[PDB]
Amino acid sequence: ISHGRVFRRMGLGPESRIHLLRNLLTGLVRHERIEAPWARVDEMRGYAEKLIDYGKLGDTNERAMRMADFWLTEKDLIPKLFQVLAPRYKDQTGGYTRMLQIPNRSLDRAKMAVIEYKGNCLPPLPLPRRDSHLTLLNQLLQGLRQDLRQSQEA
Amino acid sequence: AAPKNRRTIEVNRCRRRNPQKLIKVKNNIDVCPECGHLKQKHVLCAYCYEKVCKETAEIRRQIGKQEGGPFKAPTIETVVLYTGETPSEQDQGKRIIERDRKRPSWFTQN
Amino acid sequence: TARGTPSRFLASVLHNGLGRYVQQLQRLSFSVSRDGASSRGAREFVEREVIDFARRNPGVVIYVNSRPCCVPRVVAEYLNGAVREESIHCKSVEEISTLVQKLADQSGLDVIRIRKPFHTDNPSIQGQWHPFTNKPTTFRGLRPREVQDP
Amino acid sequence: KSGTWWDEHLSEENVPFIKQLVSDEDKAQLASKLCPLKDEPWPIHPWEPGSFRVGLIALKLGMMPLWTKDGQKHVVTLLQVQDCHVLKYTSKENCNGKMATLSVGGKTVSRFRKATSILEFYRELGLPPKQTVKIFNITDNAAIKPGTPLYAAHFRPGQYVDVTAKTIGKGFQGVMKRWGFKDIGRVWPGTKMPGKM
Amino acid sequence: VKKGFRAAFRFQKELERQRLLRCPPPPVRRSEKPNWDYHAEIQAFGHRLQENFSLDLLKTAFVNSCYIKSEEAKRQQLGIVLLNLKSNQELSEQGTSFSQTCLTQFLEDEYPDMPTEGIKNLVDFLTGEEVVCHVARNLAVEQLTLSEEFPVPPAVLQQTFFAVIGALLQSSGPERTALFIRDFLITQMTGKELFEMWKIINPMGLLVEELKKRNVSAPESRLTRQSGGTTALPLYFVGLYCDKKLIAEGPGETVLVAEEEAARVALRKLYGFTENRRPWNYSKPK
Amino acid sequence: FKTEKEFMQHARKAGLVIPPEKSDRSIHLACTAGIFDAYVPPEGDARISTERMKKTMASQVSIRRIKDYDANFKIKDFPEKAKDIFIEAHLCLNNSDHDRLHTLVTEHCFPDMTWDIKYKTVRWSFVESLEPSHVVQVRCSSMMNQGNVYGQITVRMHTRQTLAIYDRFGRLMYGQEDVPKDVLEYVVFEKQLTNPYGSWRMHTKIVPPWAPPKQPILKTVMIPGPQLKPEEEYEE
Amino acid sequence: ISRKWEKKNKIVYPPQLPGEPRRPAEIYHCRRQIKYSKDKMWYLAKLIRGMSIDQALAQLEFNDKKGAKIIKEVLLEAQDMAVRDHNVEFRSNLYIAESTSGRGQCLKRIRYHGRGRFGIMEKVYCHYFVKLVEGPPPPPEPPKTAVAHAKEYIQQLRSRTIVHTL
Amino acid sequence: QLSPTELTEMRNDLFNKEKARQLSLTPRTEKIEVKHVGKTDPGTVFVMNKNISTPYSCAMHLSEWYCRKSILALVDGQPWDMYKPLTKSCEIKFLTFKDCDPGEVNKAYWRSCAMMMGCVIERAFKDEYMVNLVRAPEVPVISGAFCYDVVLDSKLDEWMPTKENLRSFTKDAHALIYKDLPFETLEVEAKVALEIFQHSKYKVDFIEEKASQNPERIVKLHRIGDFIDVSEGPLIPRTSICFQYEVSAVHNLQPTQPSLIRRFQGVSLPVHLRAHFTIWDKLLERSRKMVTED
Ligand SMILES: [Mg+2]
Ligand SMILES: [Mg+2]
Ligand SMILES: [Zn+2]
């Protein structure tokens, strides 16, 4: 029974799980786009979002610096977090990362995901795009919406 | 426990060929609009994704040369500039990565 | 097996015997060795028995081919297209005479299990039984527990 | 030939519009059933010994302590009635039962995830689809017109009620947790073994 | 490798049988196969039938026009004596004419109450391509037939069969040929129900016309028997009554089918072609 | 790798030192790779139906060499002989008579004639000859290895032929079975003058650029565009 | 060993007469000695039976099994061969007529057990066979209807004879 | 005078004859170089047959995914039917419902759906009554429905289609969809087209109108099965492309006095753009509302 068990069991145990996520998070901050097994990227995505929130507290904040020190193994990333990533998202209240499933990797056919920090310099990922408004179904719904405006106005 | 008797081919076919054992037909396959290759609806196109990764790898190799060592992550934003392009006013005060290539059509300067 | 073999119903060729009797055997082909111990009986049959048989059965055409062979054979062909090959290897003249006459009297139909020892195209003279054959009729064809003048 | 879901082919502009449109109709469909006694209600009969009125579908909010004037504590479960309406009435003859049946519906749910046949049933009734539908055995004098809303004040304090629901699923469990356990040549039907609990 | 020859030879014959079954060779004419002598086969054909055929006439019966044309083309291309072969066209006309009139006289005598349309349809069935080709094949006619194409086309085989009947007519005269028609063509309706040979539509219409000619009242249909009427497998017996007198009764899964069968039963009785009628007499005239 | 250089480059990278082989025996060739002196068919030749002297003189020099090996040779008879060889060779295609075809055509011609039609059915017929064939050119090679001297004669043939090629399944893929069509062909014939058993055999055909395009094929064809890797971008 | 499958493409048919309907082209192709078990390969071969060439390629492309890539290459080779060498017009106008796996020539290796017993492990190989036919995929036989069932049952009743009598 | 069944036979025979006549114009096989200029498979060249091969045949060369999704073709930049023979060498592009700008594809679907309604209504009424097909109005797809202008018999002036009658029309239309009939197209001179529609005065007027617009006096004809109609633009390849099809309502257009023109209206969605049952109902309502051509 695993009712309400939010966290996955990974690696060699609890401590190993955090270190596995920390290594993935450290790679994401440096590269801004990494690809790994889907479950691990999904497990790490929450920490990636929360790390940006600590970066918004500022480097002067002692608790935030302690968080960045632990979660960022490579210390040169800590300045990047507070001075690059955090200011980038100053306006946004969330949704810092986007996660997309990519084809299963050849060796073990593991389900794979790509996760990136929105706004990176890297070439854009081929995001899924909703159908054009000009399509037949959308045009029929656009006409319906316009009529409901006239009826509402009356 | 050892088997009491040899299982006949008749019995084994019923087991091996049961619908539960057969590969299910997939209905979520589609054609990628950009490249025309096949993809699943919920998965990124393999052909298009590899195209992005190839260019991303070249840019990362260029970033490595500029940094020229480990633990040298910059404290400013990065901008990729292709041949025939000049730094924008918005893209000023940022690390500039120069690619000896024409900007890909899918990669749009912002 | 009966289950492991085919079967058929008792039959005749072209209703043979209804208007006239026609001998179904039409051709006998013998292969006999000039030299060969196994053909001794066949050679003797050709010398003293084939000619008398040929006259008795003018409807049958008999081909005797003398050639080197280890197993002398007689091929019997019938009007219905049946072909029946038999071996006369090392058979005496009497045994060959018996086999040849047996072929002459056969119809050419497959010698397989015959389901019934009788065949008729008119099994009934008075009408085949049906469930109403021995049931009396009722006034106005009323059914059990049916009410007239509904 | 391929599968589709409601917003598969909708554009960015039409996803918010359609979500509003189907939500406004639902709110207006539930507000049109708020006056059943002026919408040609079925005959309202007095209660008679041996009568069986309908029940309702409620959502289990949780539990709370309750104290009585004698100083005893009682834990109670809060059951909230959400969008409960009568859906169908079946007479004794057609129901294949001694008592007539009243079908009642529970929580409102999305129309985009319901079968076409179910969607057609609710379209005639004029109500948003429900999550659960239960059958109550009633007498002929307790029949309520389909579409009538049922409220929590259908029950009164001091009354007793049977409550039926699906139990928390524990999955495949062993004899110890399932049954509390730590020779005719065969196992009897009904023997307590490991299985879905 | 085991020393020996008999087993290997026997297995070779075994493999040849499979090689035949796997690829069954294309059927060929009997005349091409071994142990064939045309003149002897022609003589046995007559004696087998107990007929004194004229060999010159009988040989001409098997010569088809198509064969003569094909032979000429072969001779011309392979340039090599005038051929005077007479086709069986003349003989087949005489045989076809005699067979049609001979069968008509036979049927009219047996079934005086049969209408001319019924008699014609029976004569067409007895002389039909189906019946005649079946009889000809089982009498060795196809083996002696000279044709360009094998297996002999149904039309060519039927023409040759009547040509043989024409040769018999000239050889032994009309009386002898009639017994040949009786023994091989009249027998072909053994076991067959009238309407299996003579195909009719709307029997009830034909019955009403025949009753009118006899001045009988129009038949009335009534339900003599009924069972399981409201089931997928019902049974109905329908009786036809003239002046409230039963003339026929027929079963059917539906009332309409039973009524149509009753009409067929009535027609069989009227035409004297019932299932239990006196059988055909084959006793030698005496 | 198919090329020999790549094979020997792979062999040196594998340490597989293959020693060469010297033997008294050598491959014995009965024909040559190509035309000794290509005969450019004058443009407009089909339209009609000092340089000429110089070209004709070369044929007169060559015809003498052919006469030396075989004195009883007449260039006048060759056009009739060449026509017969041409017709017989093509007739062998109808019935896949390869052993007979080898006598009529050289080892250079044989692959071209029969390779493509290995699993096809060819129906070809020589309907008529519109104008008499004449020997346009006569050349002769210089002394080659093994003392082999070859003589090549080019014959211009304008004839009416019929060709219908069926595929492996009996379905018509080219031509018409009976419709006669007009064909102008320049056919080079070769003979090993040294070989005591050499005979005049069809060698090759000459296709001038002005030659009109051949009959269109029945089926439609798709010529695929560049198959590009993900990184590579298509360029018009 | 046996290599009949390769020879089937070499069959040459007589030219068809104009009346005859156009005979669909047939292409036979296979890959020998694949490093895979025929049992596992059978499911992949079964899956694409009766599919169009494009539908089969699509299903195999997104199949995780190792055999799927191998079969996909064989199918692409067969498609290219059909148009190029077998006079097939449209490459898409092909369907999987026959698709099966066969036991290859296997290698036996000395293997070990946890108690020191000596064992033979077989390194399994297999063959994949495919036959492509020109044309659209034959429509799947529809489900037997109630009307068809009733007709069959009534036919059985009507075929009943009086058993073991004159 | 020709009866309904007889009139169709005459139309088909004249349609078949002209179709054969156009094929005979090129007796021999002639090859055209069609170059694919689409986003995918760039640089592909099709050596198709002149006047026989169609865009669909080019799609068959590429893949089945092109055949299933190619609703329309852009031949030299002009909307082309999938089954319309390619006259000359040109550049070809394939259009789908989900293209960024499927305006041309949407018009072709609307025209083909309207034509499908003409066939249903023409054959739905009893023999005694006479149905005359005036035209198919060109209505933007954002209007909510497609329509066909039909002049019903005088005896039916009072009669108005009931809810049950409308359902009958849809069942006939769905029967047309189930038949999966190709949309055959013939571009004939005005003279030939006028002969086929001589019986109907409305068609003759329309034929002369369209013929005048073109300088070569060529009119586009389309046939569904045995039903021939005049169309202004290309049509979708097959009727099976439609999945949801309904005849929403029939509206009478003033002025009724000169003639009673009834606007039969319907709405439909293709298989590619299937809508949910709930969304389909919303589209159905607005289709019932009368559409005014502008
Ligand atoms: Mg683990
Ligand atoms: Mg659970
Ligand atoms: Zn793509």
Curated annotation (Swiss-Prot), chain A:
One Pfam family of this chain: Ribosomal_L17
GO terms for MF: protein domain specific binding; structural constituent of ribosome
One of the protein's GO biological processes: mitochondrial translation
Origin superkingdom: Eukaryota
Keyword Cell cycle (UniProt): no
Tissue: Detected in adrenal gland, mammary gland and adipose tissue.
Coiled coil regions in record: none
Family statement drawn from the similarity comment of this UniProt entry: Belongs to the bacterial ribosomal protein bL17 family.
NCBIfam families associated with the record: L17
Protein name: Large ribosomal subunit protein bL17m
Source organism: Homo sapiens
Lineage, highest ranks first: Eukaryota, Metazoa, Chordata, Craniata, Vertebrata
Curated annotation (Swiss-Prot), chain D:
Localisation: Mitochondrion
Subcellular location, principal: mitochondrion
Entry's Gene Ontology cellular component terms: mitochondrial inner membrane; mitochondrial large ribosomal subunit; mitochondrion
Alphabetical GO biological process terms: mitochondrial translation; translation
Similarity comment: family membership: Belongs to the universal ribosomal protein uL3 family.
Quaternary structure note: Component of the mitochondrial large ribosomal subunit (mt-LSU). Mature mammalian 55S mitochondrial ribosomes consist of a small (28S) and a large (39S) subunit. The 28S small subunit contains a 12S ribosomal RNA (12S mt-rRNA) and 30 different proteins. The 39S large subunit contains a 16S rRNA (16S mt-rRNA), a copy of mitochondrial valine transfer RNA (mt-tRNA(Val)), which plays an integral structural role, and 52 different proteins.
Disease the record associates with this protein: Combined oxidative phosphorylation deficiency 9: A mitochondrial disease characterized by failure to thrive, poor feeding, hypertrophic cardiomyopathy, hepatomegaly, and psychomotor retardation. Death in infancy has been observed in some cases.
Protein name: Large ribosomal subunit protein uL3m
From Swiss-Prot, chain E:
GO cellular component, one term: mitochondrial inner membrane
Protein name: Large ribosomal subunit protein mL44
SUPFAM superfamilies: dsRNA-binding domain-like, RNase III domain-like
Function: Component of the 39S subunit of mitochondrial ribosome. May have a function in the assembly/stability of nascent mitochondrial polypeptides exiting the ribosome.
Keywords (A to Z) from UniProt: Disease variant, Endonuclease, Hydrolase, Mitochondrion, Nuclease, Primary mitochondrial disease, Ribonucleoprotein, Ribosomal protein, RNA-binding, Transit peptide
Entry's EC annotation: 3.1.26.-
Subcellular compartments: Mitochondrion
Disease: Combined oxidative phosphorylation deficiency 16: An autosomal recessive, mitochondrial disorder characterized by hypertrophic cardiomyopathy, liver steatosis, and decreased levels of mitochondrial complexes I and IV in heart and skeletal muscle.
Enzyme class: hydrolase
Residue ranges annotated for the RNase III domain, each copy included: 56-194
Source species, domain of life: Eukaryota
Keyword Heme: no
Family designation: Belongs to the ribonuclease III family. Mitochondrion-specific ribosomal protein mL44 subfamily.
UniProtKB/Swiss-Prot annotation, chain G:
Molecular function as annotated in GO: RNA binding; structural constituent of ribosome
Residue window of the full protein shown: 41 to 206 of 206
Assembly and interaction partners: Component of the mitochondrial large ribosomal subunit (mt-LSU). Mature mammalian 55S mitochondrial ribosomes consist of a small (28S) and a large (39S) subunit. The 28S small subunit contains a 12S ribosomal RNA (12S mt-rRNA) and 30 different proteins. The 39S large subunit contains a 16S rRNA (16S mt-rRNA), a copy of mitochondrial valine transfer RNA (mt-tRNA(Val)), which plays an integral structural role, and 52 different proteins.
Family statement: Belongs to the universal ribosomal protein uL22 family.
Gene that encodes it: MRPL22
Originating organism: Homo sapiens (Human)
Superkingdom of this protein's organism: Eukaryota
Name of the protein in its database record: Large ribosomal subunit protein uL22m
Cell compartments where the protein resides: Mitochondrion
Gene Ontology biological process terms, A to Z: mitochondrial translation; translation
